[model samples]
Target: VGTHRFVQKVEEMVQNHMTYSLQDVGGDANWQLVVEEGEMKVYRREVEENGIVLDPLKATHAVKGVTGHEVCNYFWNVDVRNDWETTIENFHVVETLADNAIIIYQTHKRVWPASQRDVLYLSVIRKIPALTENDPETWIVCNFSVDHDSAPLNNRCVRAKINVAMICQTLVSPPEGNQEISRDNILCKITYVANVNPGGWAPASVLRAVAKREYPKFLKRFTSYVQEKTAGKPILF
Candidate 1:
């Protein structure tokens, strides 16, 4: 009963996120657009209360030729993440809790001056029902830091706790004959929010600069990868 209740609470949280966008992520003064490349725009804002130099980030992407379900699948699949997430290494699933929830372990490669970092988190993917007859369904995936008591961090890697939440929604364009399960024309809007701290002496300014450079690349590459994988195949709508 407790587990089910917690999951229910998370479901409610996902529903709430589906209703908001980047404009509401933070205060008007705190939120600033850091990077905008093509259809991907990245925003950075100060974490409330504790307010650090380089703080949390939010990214929004307008992806072409895919569904929200497909994007969530790509994000949850550890195999696909290893293929596309360039800064992460040794990515794999630690356990599967349910159809849409799992535990994963990942290591972020050390940059020129920063130390290597590793994380273990329990991730849950949930969906919200369509608002009306014409609207498409939306999905949200969240990751919370989890402790691995038995498995200690690698000697060379620093233990880092990072939390992420992503929401994806689909918009279908006018179709030809029929619109059911047809990939004739569609768009996926993705909103990604994350707070990653390396826990050491790495300067905040440099890390913030790195994020500005990498976020746009990550979204564009991930979208292109999806397009390549689903080309000329049955629609996943």
Candidate 2:
């Protein structure tokens, strides 16, 4: 009963973000498009309740030579997190939950004027299939803060509780019959959403600007990272 309840709550929280993330951004007044560079578009909204200005973010972009499954799979693979997630200084899985979800610890490189920060969070991923003939297979992953025994305040590091969530959904192209999936056969549309709480102390304006600038760059870098890593290799999907 205890373990069952824990899994239920984790799945429920993930479901909430997945549903909200799929809504139309244009009609959603809370999210405004703040950056649009080349193929990546970024959005942000203030979270007054949290008292942090750069509270949440959303981004959309397209990448060729990869399928939706490939994109989500690569992003969730903790082994490659530091290789592509540039801001991460250190990362480790704390525990595993049902649905292949996990709790993780991350230490981020200090961005100047602020000490290095660490966070504990629960991360989950789900595969959403087309319910209708017109729909496409989609993959969704979400990460939110949670307490864990593995996560403890260390004096060497600035222990901060960042109440943040991320969602990544991917849409893929049609495949040829009975053929192994390859780079040339796939295209992925990624809709990414996130919100980071400054945890301790930081200027609101500075944090907001950082988020606005970082989100798009993160997407672009990650897309490039996957292309480079998977280049000439068999599709991991």
Candidate 3:
């Protein structure tokens, strides 16, 4: 059934991506700042493999009124992905490996000169325990490219490869005079990194331009979506 091997690979990827996502990129000379607005900042390194532009991106954002778990939960939930994912034309779950891991197949809208692109990846969600009393527990959702027999390569779209992660940590301020904890006292710090190989030929200039325009737009739209969804709901840690 390949179930055992599949699960093992998922575990390995989760661990690897968790470490990669948590690495600090501040003061790094290779990373170039691309977008900055308020507390949100996006950076990327111009990288290419075999003449294909695979620029890696990293972004940091802080949003009040949400918890780390809340943010990761929404990001990992396939049911609501279409609501926030602006570039994707459609997506569906190909298989459910576990309660926290699943295989997704999605196609993105054609970016002008580039042909339409599609991707198949394994998406996993995890809750990490704090190492010390002073440390806060964090949540992460990792997505990495994978192959599946059900969704073989087809002529309609090029198969793109992606490795992406969303890491979040919740910060809670001390309440005054025994006041109950509320959204007002909590904030979620987010670190998002993505590396995508567009598969087929598309000019580097066009690819970089699209990345520059879309990354910031994605972060803003996603955070706002979470805020709207959790506005009146009970906080989930």
Candidate 4:
């Protein structure tokens, strides 16, 4: 069978989102640089929709010792999510759309006095070939909000919405002719974008503060987790 009906409905939009996420944000005037640490830079646009703080975030980071495929694979895999994702209380795959696509239902841990939030989204992973000889291979994992009859919103948790993408490009340097490539010769460039709607009422200040603190922390923790997990392992193309 082909992918799920939901994937077919949003395939074009997801492709556009991946392209947008991969664009460089260095010269964008609207995106404010919230966190900068070495090779990692996080930027966000302050946006309010219907009195809710819906700040959209974009982050770029370059990490050594990993390939684009490895990084994207780790992020797309549900088995290892709990090991790296700190904010979520629990998550499960509600449906298997395809080998590379799935529908997930996840509940985030309560943030202080704010009510607990849950999200249902479709997550898809793709590998794009280089368009030019000099271009690097690209891999992406895209997740966006979607409703499903099997797992409808419940009374105990507010249903939040999210649109997120993780795009990565792999760069490799060869030592000499006929020599083998190693982890040290590889680097992964990552671009992450997230736009979230906090479904219920929440203090704007609290929401912004939480986002500012959490985004950077999540990127750092996730990258570190990937590096450690892939250490001494065969490089994935």
Give the C-alpha lDDT of model 3: 0.88
Off by over 4 Å in 3: 1-4
TM-score of 3: 0.95
The digit string of per-residue lDDT tens for model 1 on 1-237 reads 126324675555555555544345434676888788888778887553244343778888888788888888887776567677888867677777777877788787777676777888878877778769787787778786766655567787787777677778888877666545456578888899877665555666776777778777877888789878877787686
Least well predicted 10-residue stretch by lDDT in candidate 4: 1-10
- Candidate 3 backbone collisions, by pair: none
lDDT of 4 by residue, 105-132 (tens): 9999999758899999999888877889
What does candidate 3 score in Cα RMSD to the true structure?
2.1
Backbone clash pairs for candidate 4 read none
Give lDDT tens digits, candidate 2, residues 1-237: 126335776667656766776676845787788999888888777675656454677777878777666777778878778678889888888887754577888888898669998888877666766688577667766677777766777776776654333344344445578655567766677788776666667787787777777778888888888778778977654
Clashes in model 2: which pairs?
A: none
Off by over 4 Å in 1: 1-9, 12-16, 19-27, 47-54, 153-155, 177-182
Give each model's whole-structure lDDT: 0.73, 0.71, 0.88, 0.88
TM-score of each: 0.84, 0.83, 0.95, 0.95
Worst 10 residues of 1 by lDDT: 46-55
